[PDB]
Amino acid sequence: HHMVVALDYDNRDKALAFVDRIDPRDCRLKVGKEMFTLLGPQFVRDLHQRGFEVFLDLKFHDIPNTTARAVAAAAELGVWMVNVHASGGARMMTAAREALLPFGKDAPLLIAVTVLTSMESSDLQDLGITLSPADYAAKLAALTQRCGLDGVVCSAQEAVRFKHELGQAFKLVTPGIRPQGSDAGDQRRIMTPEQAQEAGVDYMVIGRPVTQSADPAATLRAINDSLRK
Amino acid sequence: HHMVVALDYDNRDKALAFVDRIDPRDCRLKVGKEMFTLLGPQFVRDLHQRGFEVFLDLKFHDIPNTTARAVAAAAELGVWMVNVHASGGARMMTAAREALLPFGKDAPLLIAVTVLTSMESSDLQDLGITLSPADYAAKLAALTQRCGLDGVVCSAQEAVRFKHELGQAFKLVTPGIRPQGSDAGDQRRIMTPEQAQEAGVDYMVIGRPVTQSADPAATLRAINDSLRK
Ligand SMILES: O=c1ccn([C@@H]2O[C@H](COP(=O)(O)O)[C@@H](O)[C@H]2O)c(=O)[nH]1
Numbered sequence: 051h052h053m054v055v056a057l058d059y060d061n062r063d064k065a066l067a068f069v070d071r072i073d074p075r076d077c078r079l080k081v082g083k084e085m086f087t088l089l090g091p092q093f094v095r096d097l098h099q100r101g102f103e104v105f106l107d108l109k110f111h112d113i114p115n116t117t118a119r120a121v122a123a124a125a126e127l128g129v130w131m132v133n134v135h136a137s138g139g140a141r142m143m144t145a146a147r148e149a150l151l152p153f154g155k156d157a158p159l160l161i162a163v164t165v166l167t168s169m170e171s172s173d174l175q176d177l178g179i180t181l182s183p184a185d186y187a188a189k190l191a192a193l194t195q196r197c198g199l200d201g202v203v204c205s206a207q208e209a210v211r212f213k214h215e216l217g218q219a220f221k222l223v224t225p226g227i228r229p230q231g232s233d234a235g236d237q238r239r240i241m242t243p244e245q246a247q248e249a250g251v252d253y254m255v256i257g258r259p260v261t262q263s264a265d266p267a268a269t270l271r272a273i274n275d276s277l278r279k
Numbered sequence: 280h281h282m283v284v285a286l287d288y289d290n291r292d293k294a295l296a297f298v299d300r301i302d303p304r305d306c307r308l309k310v311g312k313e314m315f316t317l318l319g320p321q322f323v324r325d326l327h328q329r330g331f332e333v334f335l336d337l338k339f340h341d342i343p344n345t346t347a348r349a350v351a352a353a354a355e356l357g358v359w360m361v362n363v364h365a366s367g368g369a370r371m372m373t374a375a376r377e378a379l380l381p382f383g384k385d386a387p388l389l390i391a392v393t394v395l396t397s398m399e400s401s402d403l404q405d406l407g408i409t410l411s412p413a414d415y416a417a418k419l420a421a422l423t424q425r426c427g428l429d430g431v432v433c434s435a436q437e438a439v440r441f442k443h444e445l446g447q448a449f450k451l452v453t454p455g456i457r458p459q460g461s462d463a464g465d466q467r468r469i470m471t472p473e474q475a476q477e478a479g480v481d482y483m484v485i486g487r488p489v490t491q492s493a494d495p496a497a498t499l500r501a502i503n504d505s506l507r508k
């Protein structure tokens with residue numbers, strides 16, 4: 051499947067009120083920094099007990115030793131996917147990949163964030179980066195692949211280029227998904243679900259356009275219908 | 280006080296075995312990606328119940344909206360200090376500080392990571408960064424100060440420069456503290472505790488040189504005495 055719904059609530063009951071209205075065939079679920087800081091690993095158990103596979107989206111970005119132990123702790127949790135920041139460096143990503151060797155085929159997918167979907171060219175200029183978001187993401191994606199990771203988090207606007215330069219096997223997870231007529235918010239490098247599918251995206255992450263609608267389950271089912279067709 | 284001890288255990292009992300042997304007057308405690316991924320916020324509450332102030336070291340690095348809500352979750356947790364990645368950009372750091380406005384003076388200190396103490400020049404060159412770690416950290420620190428944050432995490436090797444360029448009020452938290460004779464590991468920009476004190480650091484983070492000691496409490500007290508005298 052392709053759809054991943056971001057559970058970005060500030061309340062455990064509110065999140066579970068939505069999850070109890072949907073089915074694991076509808077999507078996988080993403081647990082991010084907000085809900086994990088409030089609830090910790092028990093929330094991952096809450097979703098597993100309900101039959102969902104979980105993308106643990108904590109974007110580990112630390113020294114190699116710390117990043118490796120954090121990724122191993124995520125693997126002990128049994129999640130479907132976990133990610134790191136590619137701008138954490140090659141030694142960091144390699145330590146992360148080696149930390150998953152003890153878990154064999156049960157290890158989670160190991161993804162690296164390239165350039166966050168909220169960052170535009172002016173955002174990177176404050177950091178001294180002169181490359182466009184696409185070019186910098188491309189550089190970070192190639193480094194991630196060369197370090198042996200399974201794929202990258204990127205904007206859907208980079209999918210066609212990444213699939214062609216890095217191959218079909220390298221997995222692309224794209225947030226910054228916005229249907230026609232939904233507020234962009236802090237997102238910048240965006241694409242409709244239909245546009246992201248055409249680009250070759252493997253997994254599309256959607257949050258606020260689903261979780262903040264008058265009927266989140268129907269919105270999610272409506273998007274899935276548009277892509278399955 | 281200044282000393283902060285990194286709790287980097289893979290088992291809750293092992294960490295509490297050390298914590299039960301020390302007193303809040305000896306140090307504050309740092310909870311990182313590993314222990315938080317294994318135990319979640321309840322572990323921080325356990326430390327508060329024992330009278331310790333906690334530096335929640337999760338290095339939030341995400342889109343502005345997510346980072347702000349994660350920072351708010353940490354403030355709801357009541358921590359003394361919480362950090363973000365300065366390379367997440369100005370909008371993200373600003374969103375994080377604005378997220379703490381509802382908590383008034385009870386807000387945690389908001390710190391930004393510049394260049395990780397494990398990163399040397401060759402590590403940054405894989406990211407297209409041509410500046411030295413000191414120069415690039417200085418650029419990220421300046422952006423952090425202009426975004427209204429309370430300070431940065433940096434190497435102690437940058438303290439004398441940073442205190443002069445960024446001022447006394449901007450707080451410097453430095454890991455990479457290695458008493459002479461002890462292995463550096465994956466740390467690259469390191470200073471002894473006595474050296475970091477002379478440089479003007481506000482808070483020094485020490486991990487493995489205490490926790491892997493056959494007597495961590497006695498080792499910590501010995502370091503504190505060397506800095507006292
Ligand atoms: O480049 C990235 C990496 C991660 N996320 C995460 O993906 C989700 C997107 O949700 P939304 O912007 O659709 O509400 C959020 O959890 C956000 O933190 C992004 O938006 N962009």
Ligand SMILES: O=c1ccn([C@@H]2O[C@H](COP(=O)(O)O)[C@@H](O)[C@H]2O)c(=O)[nH]1
Nearest residue numbers: 113116285311395396454484485486487
């Ligand atoms: O630039 C940074 C920021 C944070 N830490 C954290 O500080 C601690 C350093 O402990 P140690 O390397 O002394 O064992 C670890 O928890 C690590 O994640 C660093 O080492 N360097």
